[PDB]
Each structure stands twice: as structure tokens, then as C-alpha cells.
Symmetry: none
Subunit: 207 residues, 3 copies
Amino acid sequence: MRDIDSVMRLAPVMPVLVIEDIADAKPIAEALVAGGLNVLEVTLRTPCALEAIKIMKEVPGAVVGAGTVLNAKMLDQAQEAGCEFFVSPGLTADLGKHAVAQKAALLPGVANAADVMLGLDLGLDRFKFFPAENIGGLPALKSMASVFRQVRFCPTGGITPTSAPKYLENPSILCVGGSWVVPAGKPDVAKITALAKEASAFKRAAV
Amino acid sequence: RDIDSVMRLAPVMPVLVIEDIADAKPIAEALVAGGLNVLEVTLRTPCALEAIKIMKEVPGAVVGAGTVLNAKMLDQAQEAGCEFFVSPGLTADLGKHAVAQKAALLPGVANAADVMLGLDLGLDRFKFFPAENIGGLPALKSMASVFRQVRFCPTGGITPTSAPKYLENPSILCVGGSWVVPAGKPDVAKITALAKEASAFKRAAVA
Amino acid sequence: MRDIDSVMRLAPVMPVLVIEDIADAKPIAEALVAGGLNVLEVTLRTPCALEAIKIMKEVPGAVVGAGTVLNAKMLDQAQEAGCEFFVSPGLTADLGKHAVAQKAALLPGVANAADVMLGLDLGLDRFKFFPAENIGGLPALKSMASVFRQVRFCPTGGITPTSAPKYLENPSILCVGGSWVVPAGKPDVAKITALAKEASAFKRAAVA
């Protein structure tokens, strides 16, 4: 299936989903897909997360992945649930070696040059710049992209509707991760779809 | 004792710098009398190993070593009787040595790759260090939101008025602090008064 | 011959060179040496970078190194090109292990305590603080230098002519990395030599 570069190009914004109630999963996936945000990152931060992946996987148009993958075992459990891609807050050689060996579409987080160097040693060149606003923001990413010209990025962490277009004007950025499209209360599918359509319209220099 | 239990004993772990060996016993006595029985003695001073042996004989003191940079320093602190060990950062070498030695290590972390390295080694308790140069409480709040099973001790720039704000987060078990021992000759009544105030800090993690 | 500590002490500023045209390599190296900045870091960020290193090495007095070295094979390629030192944005165990094996004067980037501890475990004690203005600046470097008292640093990343003396007042700092002496665009050899002479006169608490 798709490699992580192809996943990143599909939509300007990758929603970062924290499912506290399993009944929220289907309405959230349907509303995001209705708004054109087809790429869904379900963080493995809650007990029902893997079940939420199995529910969202059956929504037509949804490209479901697992976030907060911390090790090869969690990548395996998420892949067995049907995840098409995997995101991690940071990178280890054991996690990256396992993803390459399994041909899993992994998007590891990086915060500094040594993280990126470990990723390049493993054959990876696509990373989440995370957590963006705690590690110097767009100016820090602009410098890191200047050092690693063959790498492309997905900043995540404190991104907003106001700052997302600024990141997306950089050619080295393919998309951003975002939490604002689904507010942490009970889902409102109309509001979620309207935020998704608004984010769907964001300009991308790289696409 | 394991590091999670050590962190839960008191809201503040004093970070002690003993330059005058004569100060060690009165300081540890005053801190214990004030309810701060967990003592981190930095190894940087020449008399630090001798100070650890004196503090270990104070009843109720739980004495550990700070600024542990490598396996050799850990072995020296363990030979001196330290019950726990604190490092500014984490290496695979120091971590595998602490696990093999059954040493209660509390390694510093600054980013997700540091945490994931520790989790791969079996560690899940970390010092968030240097806290005020890596984004403070807002950055720690995000990191704790990602690593739901990890618990932290922020250290580096913590003050008596900022410490309660960190302690409102249940992922924070305690803070490290330098203010409980004022510079100059020890005033045992003043140290015990500051210690009693710190021992009364409320924390969401421990009733 | 030279270890990385001796390279850092040669001049207050190590220019961070990005060569977009091979024809500019010789004039830039000659202009820098004429201004007294003999230590030249050619970043491996453009395809012609290794070719530019071979050209600059022929300028008398030039001490040529490679920057943005990402792995052990890249260090070997830069060494075969004639580099006398090597700079890396970060540190991996594989890169540091190969550098110590080959006695290569490596200056690896650090941003946090785990980076420094990995370098110390390899026997390294000289690091660039990079990228300085995105990882907390001088206040962050001050705290890190007070943790690792035996380590000495080269801050790089957003250093300016105004801020370089501020960093160079700290005795834990041996030099700074800078881009302002040879910025982007076609070289101005008169401007480069003049900026190199001003950088050469920067006071240093550590070196004198």
C-alpha cells in the first residue's frame, strides 16, 4: 500500500485524534471524511484506541493510522487492527528497523538533528517535527530543513488554523498535524465537518 | 526500594551541593526533621562521596546521588550506599548498567526520543531536566499527555511558587529543588522551616 | 595531525560555507584566509561540496573541513577529499565511534544532556551547541556548560556579529560558528575579507 510520503500528501492537515469514548469514533471519522480530511491518526493513548481503529477503518474514504506508537509490539497490534500508517512521538532504532523490515509506513517524530540522523541511517527521510511549538516552531523547522535538504516534514504540536498556512508555505513541509478539528468535548459532526473543509482548503507550497 | 516509591515519598527532592563536609550532617538532619527525607547529593564536589556516607547515617534519610554521568560514577555512588541515582540525561550504556545493577535510576529526559529509549530499557520514571530551558510546565504537560504511563520529576529552575503548579499535574510525582538549603552556613531551624513548607505542598498524584 | 580542540582555538569564528557554485570555492577560501579566518567548514549540503573542498585545500594556509557530515561513510568521503576536520549537526553512536577509530577531528552537534553524555562515553569533550538560537541560546548554553564543566563548546545557528562576543565571553566557549561572513549569493571578496578581519579580532575569554 501507500508509503508515508504518499499519506502525507493526501491532505493539508492530519487530525490527531484522542478517542475517550468508543461511541465517538464513527461520527468523528465520518465528519472528517465529509470535510475532506481523509487521513486519521488515532493515538494509542486510550484503552479503546485499537477498537476505535477497527470502527474507523470501515468508514469509506478513511485512511486510518495509529499514533503514539512507542515500539515494535504496538506497531504490530495497530497493524493487526488495520492501520495503514503509524506515527511515533520520537524514534528508536528498534522501532525504525521493525517498520522498514515490515514495510510499514512510519512517520517518526524528531526534535533535533540527532533524531533525524538516526532516521536517515535507518533509510527514513520523512519525519514529524514534534512537538513543534515546544522546540522552536517554524523558525527552528526552517533551519532544520535547511540542514537536511532531502528530508520532508509534518510539524505537529501546537499548530493552529492561523499558523498552519505559514508552515505549509515552506516547500519542505507536506502537511501538518492538528488537534483543533475535533474539540475535546462531545463530537459535533457539523462543526467538525466545517473545520475539516476549512482545513482542506489550506494552500500547500509542496503539493 | 524502586524509583516510583522514592518519588512518592515527598513533594520535593532537595538537590544538595555539599562543599563543606561539616555541613552534611546538620543539613540532612534538618531536611529529615522537616519531612523531606529523600536527599539528592550531587557528585560534582570533591567531598560528595564522603557527604553521602555521613547523611546515610542520619535516621530516616534516603540518600541518593545526583549528576551521575556514567556507569563508573554510578558504581562509586552505589559503593557509598546511595539508594537512588539521578542523571542529567540518559544513555543506553548508563541505562543498561542501572538495570543490570538493580540501581534505582531516575534519568533526565528532554524529548520523546529520550523517553522511548528509557521505556525500551524498562524505565518509565524520569527527571524532566533542565525544566526551565526545555519549555517548563507547558512542554512537560504536552509530553505527559503523550506518554500516559510515564511519570516525571521536573528539575531545573523550580521555585517555591512554581513548584505547586507543576504538582497539580498527576503525571508529576515530585519536583527537584535547590531553595530548601539557602547558600551560606546552614541554619538548621531555617532549613527545617523551608522543608516543612515543601512537605505540605499538595500534589494531584499523591493524597 | 590537529585535534578538534586545536582547530576551535585557531580563530574566534568558524565560517559555515554553503557553496552553490564551484567557481566561487577558490575566491571564497582566498578571501577568508586573507582576512585571517583560515578554518573553513564546507557543508555537504550541495552536490559540488566535495569538489569545492578539493579546490579550497590548495589555498595556502587554508584549514579545510567538512560540515553537515551525517554518517561514517560521509566522513570517509570527506577525508578522502582532504578534510582536516569534520562537523556534524548531531551525534550518532555510529558516527562518533567511526570518528574516534580514525582519529578524525570531529565536532558533533549537541542540543541536550543525552547528546553530551553519548559524546563523553566515546571520549569526546568538544561539541558545537547547535542550533543555538532554536535550543535556548546563551542561557541554555550557560546551564549546560555548568552541568558538564570539563566540556567546551562552539555555539552555531543564528549567531550574529552582535551576539558572538556575548557567547565568546563565556570561558566554556572556544569559538562560534557563523554564516554572516559568506552569506548567500555571489561572493564579494572585498566584503568577505573585511568581515573575516573583523571576526579575527573578536575577543575570546578562553583563547586570547
